[PDB]
Structure formats: C-alpha cells, structure tokens
Amino acid sequence: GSSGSSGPGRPTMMISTTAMNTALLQWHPPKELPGELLGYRLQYCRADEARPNTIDFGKDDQHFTVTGLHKGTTYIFRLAAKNRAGLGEEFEKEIRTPEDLSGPSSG
Structure with missing residues (x-):
C-alpha cells in the first residue's frame, strides 16, 4: 500500500538504426504520470x-546517440519516467544491429 507510491507509467521509446553500428534513441513523456516530468533513467545492455x-x-533529454554497438548482436533497451514521486513503470524494447554483409565487390 504505502498510501499509493505507485509511480508514473511507461514512456514510449523508439529505437531506429541509422549509421553503421549506431542506434538512435528517441522517447517521449508519459501521460499517466501523476505530477510533472522531472527526469528519467536509461538502461540498455546485451x-x-x-x-x-x-x-x-x-x-529535456528526449533522445540519445549510441555508436559502436556490436553488429549482429541483440540488445535490450529500457526506459522509465521520473515524477515528483519518483520512477514508475519501465518500457522494454528488443532490437538487433545489422551484421556485416561482405558482399562481392565485382566491377
């Protein structure tokens, strides 16, 4: 119970691969957040x-730039919203960096 202390909801995270071995991070503030957006933590690993x-x-940080990501490897990004009460629900996202092709360089 703890007189509530539930926390905010889960933010909308959107990962998009642009550059080689780089994953663009872009999320937005939740709506089920009781109070006002103060900050949020980001967790991502293999x-x-x-x-x-x-x-x-x-x-302010609504996005992040990650470079050097291991190609051909699955990652798990996680984000959470933080309000005057604290951190709340967390969002989960599974992706996979583009592996090498080493195609034929015929001419």
Whole structure:
C-alpha cells in the first residue's frame, strides 16, 4: 500500500538504426504520470549481460546517440519516467544491429 507510491507509467521509446553500428534513441513523456516530468533513467545492455548500463537523463533529454554497438548482436533497451514521486513503470524494447554483409565487390 504505502498510501499509493505507485509511480508514473511507461514512456514510449523508439529505437531506429541509422549509421553503421549506431542506434538512435528517441522517447517521449508519459501521460499517466501523476505530477510533472522531472527526469528519467536509461538502461540498455546485451541479451547475455546481467548488468544493465544505468544512465541519467534530464526531462529535456528526449533522445540519445549510441555508436559502436556490436553488429549482429541483440540488445535490450529500457526506459522509465521520473515524477515528483519518483520512477514508475519501465518500457522494454528488443532490437538487433545489422551484421556485416561482405558482399562481392565485382566491377
């Protein structure tokens, strides 16, 4: 119970791969957040790692640029909203970086 203390909902995260070995992070503020957006944390690691890379982001930080990602590897990004009460629900997203092709360079 704890007189509620539930927390905000889950933010909408949108991951899009643009550059080689790079994943563009873009999310938005939730609507079921009781209060006002103050900040949010970002957690993303390998599908075989148990230690998620914690990162602090300001209400302003609605996106992030990740480069050097291991190609041909599945990752799991997670985001959460933080209100005057604290962090709430967390969103889950599974992606997979584009592996090498090494196609024929015939001419």
